[PDB]
């Protein structure tokens, strides 16, 4: 039997199978406690639990696709949707440090230590995987993954104990203490292997193709319009007909989508109580851009997220500025004009999406509370689904010697750490590209850069990512 | 979210055409970016 490190995407006219492999490292915990919290806010505080476990977060898109493979994805296909996912934990080498006392560290190898692996197929434990935090994976396959520690927030009971105003969320009857050691635990010793084998639900595709037409300009530019438009107001209408030059008063049969607090340049847009509780709903809905290119510069929005760096790394949503969205887009009403910045849902509407890019998420989670709309596509990129890919928790073990009969001899957790290899494969159901009788060469697919500093390549940790994000809508539909 | 680990994305600091985004730590709970919004509250008030 052959032991392999697998990596690489294989394309077809149908789905592409993209696998990657990293080296993980379950470090250590000198205390295997649970370590509740002590936040004690003073102005609704938080209340958590710090589990001694390690989950892994392969959420982003820049791990399954190389930049050459992402460029081959954009210039050849016109949709993408995942349908399968397997996570194999390869060769495990749990080892122990012997503390040379004069050298400090000497690492032998342990055959009796193990690595407790739990897969949460039943969704019993809280899901913290898809929120966009700075522990995902290395972008390049040569660096070592350090998987994050598992922790979660619960709901408790806010008290007010202190001197001035000190609040503290204590435990209530609704609060929960999920001990992960009440489960089934593939114990997974040295050399052991384990798999997950998830299967994605039917999700709508992401349509990696722009438009060569405005949605409000879909008419014959000649010929006028069969209908009329008012001239006088005040009870005596006196409607007139239209010519072909009436472009700003052409009647549309479909409205644009909502623009709830789209502005340009804290908390952004925010719900909450009077002025100071005020939790943020930062990257808007998915129907809104937060960065595009107007006639002179880049407009950058209040509701933007930076994706790195600062100056920021924002995706250029040029396909939302086209179809009647954008940042400083007011709506006007002739009520006895009222400039409004919020646009409502407007029963017949189309708002296409905020575009996915090379570094976006893949799923988040739709929360278990009911009556969702629309929630098929989450913000921060990705899909977002009921029953997401389950979390793979990885503790090592507390091997706890020696004793000597009465004594607390030694360290009693001796010291152990585990290295390994995680090979994650995911298949994406690709759709065929939309037809164009176009005759023009379509624009080329290359990541954006400015001058001299090229995109993904080593320079004199070396490897540098571009200033703008590499979006995915660069071929035209033609609507 | 994980109550540790911060957030991979950023949040604005200055406004007026020069953004100067900054990163986040684990204590930024009131400006954590959510991927799902709450539902409508058309005339929810008290007495």
């Amino acid at each position, epitope marked *: 039997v052959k032991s392999m490190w697998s990596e690489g995407a294989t394309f077809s006219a149908n789905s592409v199978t993209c696998t990657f492999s990293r080296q993980f490292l379950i470090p250590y915990d000198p205390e295997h406690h649970y370590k509740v919290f002590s*936040p004690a806010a003073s102005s609704s505080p938080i209340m958590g639990y710090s589990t001694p476990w390690r989950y892994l977060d392969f959420n982003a898109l820049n791990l399954f696709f190389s930049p050459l493979e992402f460029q081959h994805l954009i210039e050849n296909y016109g949709s993408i949707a995942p349908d399968a996912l397997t996570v194999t934990i390869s060769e495990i080498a749990v080892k122990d440090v012997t503390d040379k*006392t004069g050298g400090g560290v000497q690492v032998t190898d342990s055959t009796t230590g193990r690595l407790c692996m739990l897969v949460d197929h039943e969704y019993k434990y809280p899901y913290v995987l898809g929120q966009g935090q700075d522990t995902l994976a290395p972008e390049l396959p040569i660096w070592v993954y350090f998987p994050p520690q598992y922790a979660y927030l619960t709901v408790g009971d806010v008290n007010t104990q202190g*001197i001035s105003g*000190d609040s503290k969320k204590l435990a209530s009857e609704e609060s929960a203490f999920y001990v992960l050691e009440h489960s089934s635990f593939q114990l997974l010793g040295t050399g052991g292997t384990a798999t997950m084998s998830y299967k994605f639900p039917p999700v709508p595709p992401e349509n990696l193709e722009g438009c060569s037409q405005h949605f409000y300009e879909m008419y014959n530019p000649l010929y006028g319009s069969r209908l009329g438009v008012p001239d006088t107001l005040g009870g005596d209408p006196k409607f007139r007909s239209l010519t072909h030059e009436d472009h700003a008063i052409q009647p549309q049969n479909f409205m644009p989508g909502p623009l709830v607090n789209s502005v340009s340049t804290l908390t952004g847009l925010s719900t909450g109580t009077s002025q100071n509780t005020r939790i943020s709903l930062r990257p808007g809905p998915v129907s809104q851009p937060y960065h595009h290119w107007d006639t002179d510069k880049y407009v950058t929005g209040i509701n933007a997220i930076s994706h790195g760096q600062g100056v920021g790394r924002f995706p250029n949503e040029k396909e939302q500025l086209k179809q009647l969205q954008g940042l400083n887009m007011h709506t006007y009403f002739p009520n006895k004009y009222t400039d409004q910045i919020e646009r409502p849902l407007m029963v017949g509407s189309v708002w296409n999406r905020r575009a996915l890019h090379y570094e976006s998420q893949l799923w988040s989670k739709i929360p278990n509370l009911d009556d969702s709309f629309k929630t098929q596509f989450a913000a921060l990129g990705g899909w977002g689904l009921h029953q997401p890919p389950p979390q793979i928790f990885l503790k090592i073990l507390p091997q706890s010697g020696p004793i000597g009969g009465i004594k607390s001899m030694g360290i009693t957790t001796l010291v152990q750490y585990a290295v390994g290899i995680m090979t994650v494969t995911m298949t994406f159901k690709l759709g065929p590209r939309k037809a164009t009788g176009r005759w023009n060469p379509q624009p080329g697919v290359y990541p954006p850069h400015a001058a001299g500093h090229l995109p993904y390549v080593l320079y004199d940790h070396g490897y540098e990512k571009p200033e703008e994000l590499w979006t995915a809508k660069s071929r035209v539909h033609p609507l | 979210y994980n109550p540790l680990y911060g957030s991979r994305l950023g949040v604005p600091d200055t406004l007026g055409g020069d953004p100067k985004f900054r990163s986040l730590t*684990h*204590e930024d709970h009131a400006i954590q970016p959510q991927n799902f919004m709450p539902g409508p509250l058309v005339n929810s008030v008290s007495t």
Partner: antibody
Amino acid sequence: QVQLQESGPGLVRPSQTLSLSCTVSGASISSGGYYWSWIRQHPGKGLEWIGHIYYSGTVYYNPSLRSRVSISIDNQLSLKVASVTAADTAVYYCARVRVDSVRGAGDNGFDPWGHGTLVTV
Amino acid sequence: AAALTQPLSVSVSPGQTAIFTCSGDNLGDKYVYWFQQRPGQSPALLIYQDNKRPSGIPERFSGSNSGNTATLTISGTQSTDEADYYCQTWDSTVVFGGGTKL
């Protein structure tokens, strides 16, 4: 450069609210991840830590001085230690720590300190 | 740990070293920070993360952290290092040490 200047009221013995303040110069305090500590030092003895506060309201306290002191922020970094029947006057420093990444162990230390005020009790 | 141990004072001459002890339970898997407090002045961050020094601190200060102790070694002590040195860790709140009076 970032400097921290204190404010001392003087001396009040018969159990009044000891109020302090620490205006930060060089950089604003609601500009990102930095704790803001209050640290004591008894003359002839080691240092003592009261508590630190983030700009979004969350404040950690010392478990020994928990029900006496109160840290607050109105771009002022106040401290309102009451019940001064125990005659602790020592010294009151301000200090800033960069907020760590993993929340488990402290990745940074108190690099910018204050000048220190001498309260008497 | 939650209670750092540190002796009272040390005696040194110019031309040699003075190594202090900052004892503590499981201090090897922790960060220890050293603070230089000259008399009449606030402390300054001397050695952070058990080996590193900032730009304002000269290159004659170095430390270590192994097992249940963390040392601070001064290489070639001058006539201006007579200062109280405190070790400080983070046992989930903050833990300050006693201080070796030099």
